[PDB]
Design a protein around this ligand. Structure first.
Ligand code: GLU
Ligand code: GLU
Ligand code: GLU
Lengths: 414, 415, 415
């Protein structure tokens, strides 16, 4: 007889979600999600009827220490309360000891989440940004060199001669006025001087006309600064607390690791108080959102890559994956379901249905501007905050000139 | 006597419109339009009298919800309530099952309608726009301050007061000419004057070069991306609602087609709430116009163009035809007229009378279409109307100086 | 006794490579590589003695042309030539039906390889490219001409020869200073001098603004589109030939998949002539390298990432993975040997030893680390090495003038 197989699963977005008409609809229609579509495909390929059920406590869990009492979904499968589990259940060595897994239908790794740092205004002195620091060094050394060669060449006192007005202070003024592309009231009037001037006018031309080119795109830059980038530094500084899900594979992974960085992270997490762990994923996400970015959460990238799809998008991934693991369908040991389930999983992976469902349940429901923001239209006008830095040095120079004038006055008239 | 031909049709513009004197006229003269002319032509060719009517409930009609009853005009034909339909009845595979269609008399496709995103209107003084108002405000207090400091510091006790030319007015001129980068005829010689000159030159640079830069930034291109043609973007976002006419070929097309983008659009339309459908094309256009651009209506492209080639010309067509279909005269599969109507439509198509008729009711009134095609060229030369605001300032400042000279002369005369 | 396990594998780099002393070594020590380390780990876990071999004909193998005979590794395995295969054997549905696979020990996807389109580097004097080469040669004769005509016309009989300062050398200075737009000491006062000044100013205005312009034009953006990834430029056109490895999972994937782009690629590959297939990955890479960029090869991305890390690193990977697959240890169906091997692979995966070995054999020998990926940031600041050619000219001209002053002084002394 067509026995309805007792499926067991857990509510988690977007794998299993309660449809909004659950107050009126009845049966399986109340449940939709990626795992519901996968279960439908599997049942259709195997050709049997099924009844959905939900785990009694919502825990993935493991065997309790020193009692060996299995619980959660694993307890449900070991003790035969259900026939097959279809859920994001990570393959691990301890679970393979008692339950069989199909070949993995999706691959994922550990990922890290923080509250995003909002973009910031450009700095005060962003007008000198388009050119590197060494260029602003060499421009000053070139200015000094031309200034002093032009003095040395004139006023050489041949076989008194004083026709050359180019004292050191007027040669120094001439070189500056020439560089700023402003006029001047004197010219070298001699061949070696004309030679020295003509090269500096070339240098000038080539330099200015290569700095005025890109200046709009530089006064405004939008995005800068981030708190961390490699996510390794969370092992080195205690300014930001972090933790993991309870009764999850991730906690066992960090307990079991022997890499010094992960063992240090575990040693911190295993003794810091108040409790850094959470009972559910969304509680963790809300804690991160509220804690001003002072708290960071570790979760499988299969979740982070969805959390960033949904508004308000105040949180973003960092760093690369620490490892790689797979999800799988699970069955009681020795049950006849295992081999046709494995063949069905293979055939669905070969047909590309899994990718179609991945697009259906990840990218069709994204709304934040990360989906498309490449238009990058021109910024309108040019706000004063972008240019305010130019006025401060002006007023400081006006304030310095008066001081120099007054000290020169009181020095001379004494 | 022979039986007078009972013709049937639906009130639709500009195919069939109420004559302005409908409250006073009598007989067939109450109706005029494209299809009334076409009916007159077919009548003159075939030679029979005819009496017009209007369909009872204003629906093109289709097969009902699997009850296999046909509503509207198709039902009026099949069940013998009328003898011939003359209307924009779209040829479809299900309708050929029960009625005969002539060869098509016009060609059309599915198309989209949305609100037009305005038209650009530069100001007279648009050249002031690449810098914000408060820069043009603060730079004047900057100029005043630099001038009055340079005066305060130049004409200060040399110990010989006659030594230096930088009086107030020459400082006020020098700092102006220095800001315009148009050269000068004097330069300060005191150190305290030279530092205030050099700082003003440094300001001058950054500023006049950031104006030229941003100025150029604009004159590159100014366009609005809009939804891309083929309207595939309607499948990528929920920001814009859309719907179709109730009981129409377009609704059956969306229900039936297995093209994944169209199937997704159907899945949206068949699940979105509240109801997006409308009973008439007029209501569809109104729901476009009033919805602040958040709604789009899907309709036959030969009806789209009429909404835009005639006043108020406020919408914008987007995209091309998604398919190809035709209209046809249709008759019960129980009558002999299926041959002379075909021969008539072919004869009229070959004599070009259809083109004369189309250019009587669509484009003969092409008021808005003057230069309406535009261009995508990014190399258009500047027109004089972009610059006139500088010529007015030049002429006004000439008139101002040519006035001030007279009063200075009269003062010099009477003093 | 624990009977010696007959292991089998295929020569492939870096999974299994010949030891440098293979002409002198004996026993198992002739072979080293990633899979030899993995085999040693499994042997240390389960303790059995093992003897390595190499597959007889160098093929991964598949079911024959409907004759239902298996060649290559899977053939040697099923018919009992060998007891366990340790190689990059892709898990596939047709293979599961006859042999058993452990859980996958590595992840990979299909990827595309082409020749990298070389590079260009700025010259020392790259600042002179933005205009021309013949313009820089034909502007010196312009300068000489304007100079010598201005001299010819200025110092012409005023009837008083001493009236005008524009001797040869002052004309030669004036026209230079005028060209640089850096002002001047004096201006001509004769009409015939003023017209030649006024024309030179116009030439300057129309030339120096087109240099600055084109100069800017470049510094906007610099990138080469290259062949579009995701098999677009492979499916759009026949311009680039491509073909899979013979007797491999990729050929079966392209045959079987009903994705229209992939089906079109298969239709091309199954009809292009002459034969595009190759027997080894080395031949595939050679046919990429030598074909002047007109050929592409389709291989596992874990192979691609190794070729992009071997001398001289001339290829480029394009696009992401087209799919997802894994590798597995495989054993004859129903044999007891595999049940502890699945647990061994899980244990080694959890202890992270697979990551250690991957680093040891892909990255702990990354001598080819050119790291020439760069960035797409169009806001990069100018580096000093883009400008040094102007500083060398400045210093050389300073040195030249500082030399000429001494010989002028010595002449003035001795004359
Ligand atoms: N997939 C995990 C969820 C919790 C975790 O990643 O630690 C499990 O079944 O345990
Ligand atoms: N020709 C269409 C008119 C309505 C529409 O689909 O736009 C029909 O018969 O249904
Ligand atoms: N892993 C592949 C190697 C050849 C290929 O990638 O085409 C196979 O077993 O067929």
């Amino acid at each position: 007889e067509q026995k309805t197989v007792v499926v067991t699963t857990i509510l988690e977005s977007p794998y299993v979600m309660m449809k909004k008409n659950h107050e009126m609809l009845e049966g399986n229609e109340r449940y939709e999600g990626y795992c519901v579509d996968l279960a439908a495909e599997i049942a259709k390929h195997c050709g049997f009827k099924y009844k959905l059920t939900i785990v009694g406590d919502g825990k993935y869990g493991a065997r309790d220490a020193d009692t060996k009492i299995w619980n959660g979904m694993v307890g449900e499968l070991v003790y035969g309360k259900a026939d097959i589990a279809i859920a994001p259940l990570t393959i691990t060595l301890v679970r393979e000891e008692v339950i069989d897994f199909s070949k993995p239908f999706m691959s994922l790794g550990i990922s890290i989440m923080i509250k995003k740092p909002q973009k910031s205004k450009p700095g005060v002195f962003s007008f000198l940004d388009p050119l590197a620091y060494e260029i602003w060094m060499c421009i000053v050394f070139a200015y000094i060199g031309v200034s002093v060669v032009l003095f040395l060449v004139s006023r050489f006192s041949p076989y008194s001669e004083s026709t050359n007005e180019f004292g050191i202070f007027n040669s120094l003024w001439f070189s500056l006025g020439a560089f700023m592309q402003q006029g001047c009231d004197i010219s070298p009037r001699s061949l070696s001087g004309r030679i020295v001037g003509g090269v500096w006018w070339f240098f000038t031309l080539i330099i200015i006309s290569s700095y005025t080119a890109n200046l709009a795109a530089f006064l405004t830059v939008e995005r800068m600064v981030s708190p961390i980038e490699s996510a390794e530094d969370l092992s080195k500084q205690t300014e930001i607390a972090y933790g993991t899900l309870d009764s999850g594979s991730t906690k066992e992974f960090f307990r079991r690791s022997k890499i010094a960085v992960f063992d240090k992270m575990w040693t911190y997490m295993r003794s810091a108080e108040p409790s850094v762990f959470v009972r559910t994923t969304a509680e963790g996400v809300a804690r991160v959102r509220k804690s001003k970015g002072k708290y960071a959460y570790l979760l499988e990238s299969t979740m982070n890559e969805y959390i960033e799809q949904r508004k308000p998008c105040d949180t973003m991934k960092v760093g690369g994956n620490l490892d790689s693991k797979g999800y799988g369908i699970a069955t009681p040991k020795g049950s006849s379901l295992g081999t046709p389930v494995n063949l069905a999983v293979l055939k669905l992976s070969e047909q590309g249905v899994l990718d179609k469902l991945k697009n259906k349940w990840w990218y069709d429901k994204g709304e934040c501007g990360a989906k498309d923001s490449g238009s990058k239209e021109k910024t309108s006008a040019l706000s004063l905050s972008n240019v305010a830095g130019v006025f401060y040095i002006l007023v400081g120079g006006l304030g310095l000139a008066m001081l120099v004038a007054l000290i020169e006055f009181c020095y001379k008239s004494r």
